[PDB]
Amino acid sequence: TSQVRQNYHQDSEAAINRQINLELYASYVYLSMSYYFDRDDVALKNFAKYFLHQSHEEREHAEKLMKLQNQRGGRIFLQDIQKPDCDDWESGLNAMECALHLDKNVNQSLLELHKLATDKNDPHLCDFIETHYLNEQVKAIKELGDHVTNLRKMGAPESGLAEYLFDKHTLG
Amino acid sequence: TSQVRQNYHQDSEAAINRQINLELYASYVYLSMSYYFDRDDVALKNFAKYFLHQSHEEREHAEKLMKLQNQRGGRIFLQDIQKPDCDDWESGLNAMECALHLDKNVNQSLLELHKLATDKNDPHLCDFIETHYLNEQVKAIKELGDHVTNLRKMGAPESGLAEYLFDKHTLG
Amino acid sequence: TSQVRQNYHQDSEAAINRQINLELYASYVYLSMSYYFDRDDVALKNFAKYFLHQSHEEREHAEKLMKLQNQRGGRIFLQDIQKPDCDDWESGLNAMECALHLDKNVNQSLLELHKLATDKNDPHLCDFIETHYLNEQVKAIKELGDHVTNLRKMGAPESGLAEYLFDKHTLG
Amino acid sequence: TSQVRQNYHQDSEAAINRQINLELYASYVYLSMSYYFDRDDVALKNFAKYFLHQSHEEREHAEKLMKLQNQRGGRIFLQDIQKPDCDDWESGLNAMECALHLDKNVNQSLLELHKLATDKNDPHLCDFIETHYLNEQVKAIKELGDHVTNLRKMGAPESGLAEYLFDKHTLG
Amino acid sequence: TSQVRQNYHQDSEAAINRQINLELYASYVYLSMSYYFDRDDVALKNFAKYFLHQSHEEREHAEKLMKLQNQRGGRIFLQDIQKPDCDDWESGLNAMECALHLDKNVNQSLLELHKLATDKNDPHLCDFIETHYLNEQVKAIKELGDHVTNLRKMGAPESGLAEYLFDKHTLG
Amino acid sequence: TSQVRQNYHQDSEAAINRQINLELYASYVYLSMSYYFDRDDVALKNFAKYFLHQSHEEREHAEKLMKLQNQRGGRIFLQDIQKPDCDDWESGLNAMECALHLDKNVNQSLLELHKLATDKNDPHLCDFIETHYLNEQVKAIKELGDHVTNLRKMGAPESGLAEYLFDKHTLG
Ligand SMILES: [Ca+2]
Ligand SMILES: [Ca+2]
Ligand SMILES: [Zn+2]
Ligand SMILES: [Zn+2]
Ligand SMILES: [Zn+2]
Ligand SMILES: [Zn+2]
Ligand SMILES: [Zn+2]
Ligand SMILES: [Zn+2]
Ligand SMILES: [Zn+2]
Ligand SMILES: [Zn+2]
Ligand SMILES: [Zn+2]
Ligand SMILES: [Zn+2]
Ligand SMILES: [Zn+2]
Ligand SMILES: [Zn+2]
Ligand SMILES: [Zn+2]
Ligand SMILES: [Zn+2]
Ligand SMILES: [Zn+2]
Ligand SMILES: [Zn+2]
Ligand SMILES: [Zn+2]
Ligand SMILES: [Zn+2]
Ligand SMILES: [Zn+2]
Ligand SMILES: [Zn+2]
Ligand SMILES: [Zn+2]
Ligand SMILES: [Zn+2]
Ligand SMILES: [Zn+2]
Ligand SMILES: [Zn+2]
Ligand SMILES: [Zn+2]
Ligand SMILES: [Zn+2]
Ligand SMILES: [Zn+2]
Ligand SMILES: [Zn+2]
Ligand SMILES: [Zn+2]
Ligand SMILES: [Zn+2]
Ligand SMILES: [Zn+2]
Ligand SMILES: [Zn+2]
Ligand SMILES: [Zn+2]
Ligand SMILES: [Zn+2]
Ligand SMILES: [Zn+2]
Ligand SMILES: [Zn+2]
Ligand SMILES: [Zn+2]
C-alpha cells in the first residue's frame, strides 16, 4: 500500500484500470475511422480530421485517468488495446452511428464507475468523473447525435453528395 | 395621476400594456423555436441561433415599451406570458412560416396602436411607434418572407438537404 | 426515445421542465421589479439596473436548462410564465426582501431537483445542478440578504434617504 | 436563524467550524516548519520557502471556509490554534513526512465533512468540499509523497548532501 | 548556542517569542473581526476587507519577528494562538474600539521589548523594534483612533446609517 | 485494387501493416514507462515527461505509416496493441535499457521493411523508410545509449541519487 493511498477502494482502483483500457480502445476505434476516410476510394478529409481529433482526445482522457490512478496511490495495470470491430466503416453516416454507439458505451461504463464511487463513499473519485468525464461525454454524445441526424436528413448514406457536403460544411 | 403625465390617454396606456405582453409572447415563441432546432433529432444550429437572436430582440422591444410607459407616466401592468401554440415546430420552413405569421400579427397590433395614437392626438406615441417599431417590423417581415421563399424554392420541407444548406448558407 | 438519451429518468426530464419555467418566472419578477424602480414616482435607477441585470441572468439560466434538456435527449415542454404577484413593489427594501424570498424558493426547487438526481442515480444531472446552479444561487441569496440588512440598518423603508443612498453607494 | 439559511444542518455548521480550525492549525504547522529550515544550523532556504507557501495556502483555505460558513448563514466559532507537536523538525525528510501525515489527516477530516454533507442531503456543501478541497488535497498529498520518495531515494536524512541538492533542484 | 549568536540575551530571545505569539494573536483577532462584518446580518464589506488586511499585516509582522529570532541565533518557540475574546463584535464602532485597545496592548508589549533591549545593551534589537515596529504601531493606533472618532461623531453605533456611510467613504 | 495502386507489392502492404502495429506497440510501452515514473514511490517527473514525449512520437510514426499505406493504395489492417511486457519498470536505468532494446527491435523491423522494398523494386517505399524512419531511429538509439551510459557511470540503479540527478540535469 502506497504512502498516499487514502479512501481508495481496491474495486475503484480496478474500475479505473478498466476505464483506462476503454479510453485507449475508443482512441483506437477513432484512429481506424480516421484513416478509413483518408482512403482514396472514400476521400472525406474532414471526416478524417474529425475522427483523428477524437482519437487524440480519447488518448488524452486515458492519460488523465492514468494520472488519477497514480494520484490516489493506485497501481496502473494496462491491458491489450483490442483492434476495432471493423476495418471498413462503410460511410460517413455509418461511422458517425458507430461513434455514437461507442460513446454511449464509454458513458455507461463511466456511469458505472461513478456508481461504484458512490457505493465506496469516494467523493474525490466522484468529482473527478463528474468534472472531467461525464459532461464532456454528454456533449460528445449530443454532437455525434446531431451529426447522425443531419447526415440522415441530408440523404446519407445513399447520397454521396450528402456526405461530401456535410464533410465541407459541418466538419470543415 | 403621475406628475409627468401629459397628453396620454388611458386607452393608449392600456394599449401599451397589451403590446408589452405581445412582445414578451413573441420572445417566448422564438425561444421555443430556437431550442426546437437545438434538439438532437433536428440539429440545425443556425436556425437555433437565428431564433435565439430574434427572441432576445423581442424581449428588448418589450423592455423599450416598458421604458416608454414609464416615460409618459403610465403604469405598467404585466400579464402572463402564454406558452407558444406548438412544442414541436416540424421543420425549418414551418418555423419560418410561423414566425412570419407571428410577426404580421405583432405588426397588425402595432398598426392598431398607431391608429389609437392618431385617434387620441398623441404625436409622441405616434413617433415612438413609427421610429422604433414599424420599420423594424417591416424589415423583419420582409426578411422572414425572403427566408420562407428560399426554403420553399430549395425544396423544403421534404428536402432535409434544403434546410441543412439554408442553415449553413443563409443563417450561418 | 432520443438516440442520445442515456441514464435520464422521465421524472428528471419533467423536473427540468418545471425548473425552466421557474427560472423564466424569476426573470419576469425581476423585470417587473426593475421597471417599478424606473417609475417617475420611485426613481431609483440603480435598483432598476440591478434588477434588470438579475432578470437577464435568470433568463440565461432558463436557456442553459433548455440546453441541458436537449443535451440529455429530454423534450422541452414550456408552460405559461405567470405574472408576478405584485405590480407595485412598495420600496427598495421590500423588493429586495421579495427577491430574497424568491431566490430561496428557486433554491429549494433546485435542491429538490438535486435530490431527484440522487434518487435516480443521475450524476451528470447532479454535477450540472451543483456546478452551474447551487453555488450561484447561494451567492445570490447571500448578496440579497446583505442588501436587505444594509437597507434595514440604514432606516429603509421609512427613510427615503436610506434607499437613495444605498442606490448610489451599493447598487451604483 | 439567519435570513439566508437554507438546507444547512446544525451538524454541518459545526463540522465547518472544526475544519476552519484544522486548516489554521495546518497553516501553523507549516509556518513552524518554514522557520525551522530558516535556522542557521539547518539553512535550507527552499524548504523554508516551500513550507511558507504551504502555510499561506492553508490560511487561505481557512478563510474560504469562513466565507462559506457565512454564505450559508452559519455562525463562525473560532477555537485556539494549537501549537505544532514539534519545535524542532529534525530534517528535510522528516518535515516532509510530517507534512504528508498532516495532509492525510486534514483529508480524512474533509472526507468526513463530505460524508456528513451526503448524510444531511446538502449538495451545495458537497460540491464546495469536492471542487475547492478534495482534489487540491489529493494533489498536495501526491506532491508530498513524491518529495518524501525522492529524499529517501537520495539518501536523506543521513546524507545532508541529499537534502541540500533536493532543496536546490526540486524546491528551487 | 548558535554559531551566529552574539550579544543576544536569553531574556530577549524569550521576549521575541512572546511578541511573535502576540502578533499571531492580533492577526487572529482581526481575522475574526473581518468575517464578523462578512455575516449577512452585518454586511459591511469594507470593514471586512479592512480587518482582513490588518490580519494579514499582523501575520507578516509575526513572520518578520521569526526571521529576526533566527538571524540572531535565538530559537523559535511557538505557543497556542488563543481565540479572540469575542465571537460577535457588535458594531463597526465597537470593533474599531476593540482594535484600538488591542493595538495599544501590542504597543505596550513592544515598548517593554524595547526597554529590555536597552537593559541588555542590545542595540541591534533596539533598532529592529524601532524601525520595523514602533512607528507602524503608532500610525495604526492613530488611524484606529481617527476611525473611532469619526464613527462616534457620525452617530455610530445607534445609527446604522453612520456605519454604512463610513464603510463606503472611509474604508472603501 | 485501388485506382492509385502502382508498384506496390502485396508483401510490402502487409509489412507496412505489421510496422504500424509495432509503432503503436512502442507508443504503448513508452506510455506505460511514463506513468511508472509518475508513481509516488518512483517520482521522477522528467523521466515521466521524457517517455510521454517518446510515446506521442511513436503514435505519430504509426499515423505517418497509415498515411503512407493509403497514399500507395494499400489497405490498413489494424491489430491488437499488446500490453507491454512489464507493469513495473524497476528503475530509470532499467527503463532506458528496455527502451534501447525496444528501439533496436523496431529498427531491425524497419531494416527488414527496407530489404523488402529493395527486393520488390519499390524505391518510393525505400525513400519513405530512409527519410522518415531510419535516421530518426538511429538518433533515438544513440540518445538512449547515451542515457544508459550516463546512468550506469553515475552509479544507477543502486544510487537513487544518480537517477534523481540525471532526471534533473539531462532529462530536465
Ligand atoms: Ca462537482
Ligand atoms: Ca534608528
Ligand atoms: Zn473518452
Ligand atoms: Zn498526451
Ligand atoms: Zn484481439
Ligand atoms: Zn469519447
Ligand atoms: Zn460527489
Ligand atoms: Zn457522485
Ligand atoms: Zn417585436
Ligand atoms: Zn434587456
Ligand atoms: Zn396558458
Ligand atoms: Zn418581431
Ligand atoms: Zn405623427
Ligand atoms: Zn402617426
Ligand atoms: Zn436562476
Ligand atoms: Zn440568451
Ligand atoms: Zn396567470
Ligand atoms: Zn436567481
Ligand atoms: Zn454527484
Ligand atoms: Zn449530487
Ligand atoms: Zn488545507
Ligand atoms: Zn487571506
Ligand atoms: Zn495547547
Ligand atoms: Zn493542506
Ligand atoms: Zn454532490
Ligand atoms: Zn457529495
Ligand atoms: Zn546540480
Ligand atoms: Zn503587529
Ligand atoms: Zn508571509
Ligand atoms: Zn484558549
Ligand atoms: Zn497591529
Ligand atoms: Zn538604540
Ligand atoms: Zn533603543
Ligand atoms: Zn517509431
Ligand atoms: Zn496524431
Ligand atoms: Zn495480449
Ligand atoms: Zn522509436
Ligand atoms: Zn532507394
Ligand atoms: Zn533502399
Segments making up each domain of chain C, as ranges = 1-172
Q: Any idea which ligand is nearest the CA of E82?
A: 30
CA diameter of chain A = 60
Q: What is the distance between the alpha carbons of residues D106 and D142, in angstroms, rounded to a whole number? A: 14
Q: Do A126 and D130 touch (CB under 8 A)?
A: yes
DSSP F90-136: -SHHHHHHHHHHHHHHHHHHHHHHHHHHHHTT-HHHHHHHIIIIIHH
Could you tell me the sign of the dihedral formed by the alpha carbons of D99, D104, D108, D114, in that order? positive
Contact E34/E48 with Cβ under 8 angstroms? yes
Contact A97/A141 with Cβ under 8 angstroms? no
- Residue D7 distance to chain C (closest CA, Å): 8
DSSP state of F87: S
| HSE-CB for F36 with a 13 A CA cutoff | 22
- Taking contacts as CB-CB distances below 8 angstroms, the residues of chain C near A153 are none
Q: Do B40 and A149 touch (CB under 8 A)?
A: yes
Residue with cell 512489464: F86
Q: How many CB atoms lie within 10 A of CB A141?
A: 25
Q: How many CB atoms lie within 10 A of CB C106?
A: 21
The helix (run of H) or strand (run of E) holding residue B7 is none
What are the residue ranges of helices labelled H in chain D? 10-37, 45-72, 92-119, 123-129, 135-153, 160-169
Q: What is the distance between the alpha carbons of residues F17 and A106, in angstroms, rounded to a whole number? A: 28
Contacts of A166 (CB under 8 A, 6+ apart): A92, A147, A150, A151, A154, A156, B164
Q: Do B38 and C87 touch (CB under 8 A)?
A: no
Helices and strands counted in chain B (H then E)? 6, 0
Contact A44/A37 with Cβ under 8 angstroms? yes
Could you tell me the sign of the dihedral formed by the alpha carbons of F144, F148, F154, F160, in that order? positive
Q: What is the distance between the alpha carbons of residues A56 and F114, in angstroms, rounded to a whole number? A: 29
**For the purposes of burial, counting CB atoms within 10 Å of the CB of B121, is it exposed (0-12), middle (13-18) or buried (19 or more)?**
exposed
Chain B with chain C: Cβ pairs closer than 8 A: 79
Residue with cell 411607434: B129
- Residue C98 distance to chain D (closest CA, Å): 12
Please name the chains neighbouring C, where neighbouring means 3+ C-beta pairs under 8 angstroms: A, B, D, E
Per DSSP, what are the bridge partners of residue E81?
Answer: D81
Q: Do F43 and D162 touch (CB under 8 A)?
A: no
Q: Which three cell numbers stand for residue A98?
A: 458507430
Q: Do C123 and A139 touch (CB under 8 A)?
A: no
CATH topology classification for C1-172: Ferritin (1.20.1260)
Q: F–C contact (≥3 CB pairs within 8 Å)?
A: no
Tell me, in angstroms, the distance from the centre of ligand 27 to residue F152's CA: 18
- Taking contacts as CB-CB distances below 8 angstroms, the residues of chain C near B17 are none
Contact E92/E163 with Cβ under 8 angstroms? yes
Q: Do E43 and C146 touch (CB under 8 A)?
A: yes
Pick left, alpha or beta for residue F161 (phi over 0 → left; psi -120 to 50 → alpha; otherwise beta). alpha
**For chain B, what's the residue count?**
172
Tell me, in angstroms, the distance from the centre of ligand 21 to residue D64's CA: 10
Q: What is the distance between the alpha carbons of residues A43 and A37, in angstroms, rounded to a whole number? A: 6
Chain D with chain E: Cβ pairs closer than 8 A: 79
Q: What is the distance between the alpha carbons of residues D76 and E116, in angstroms, rounded to a whole number? A: 39
DSSP state of D130: I
Three-state secondary structure string covering C94-156 = HHHHHHHHHHHHHHHHHHHHHHHHHHCCCHHHHHHHHHHHHHHHHHHHHHHHHHHHHHHHCCC
Closest residue in chain D to residue A73, using alpha carbons only: D142
Q: Which of D1, D8, D16, D127 to mutate to test the interface with C (most CBs of C within 10 A)?
A: D127
Out of D149, D155, D162, name the one closest to residue F43 (CB). D149
Q: Which three cell numbers stand for residue C16?
A: 427540468
Tell me, in angstroms, the distance from the centre of ligand 39 to residue B97's CA: 68
Tell me, in angstroms, the distance from the centre of ligand 18 to residue C103's CA: 5
Q: What is the distance between the alpha carbons of residues A128 and A72, in angstroms, rounded to a whole number? A: 11
Q: Do E40 and D79 touch (CB under 8 A)?
A: no
- Taking contacts as CB-CB distances below 8 angstroms, the residues of chain E near C169 are 164-165, 168
Tell me, in angstroms, the distance from the centre of ligand 28 to residue D80's CA: 19
Chain D with chain F: Cβ pairs closer than 8 A: 36
Out of E40, E161, E165, name the one closest to residue C149 (CB). E40
- Taking contacts as CB-CB distances below 8 angstroms, the residues of chain C near A138 are 71-72, 124
Could you tell me the sign of the dihedral formed by the alpha carbons of A164, A165, A171, A172, in that order? positive
Q: Do B161 and A149 touch (CB under 8 A)?
A: no
- The resolution of the experimental structure, rounded to one decimal in Å, is 2.2
Contacts of D30 (CB under 8 A, 6+ apart): D51, D52, D54, D55, D58, D99
For residue C84, is the peptide bond before it cis, meaning its omega torsion is within 30 degrees of 0? Answer: no
Q: Do A148 and C3 touch (CB under 8 A)?
A: yes
Per DSSP, what are the bridge partners of residue D81?
Answer: E81
Q: Which three cell numbers stand for residue B44?
A: 440545425
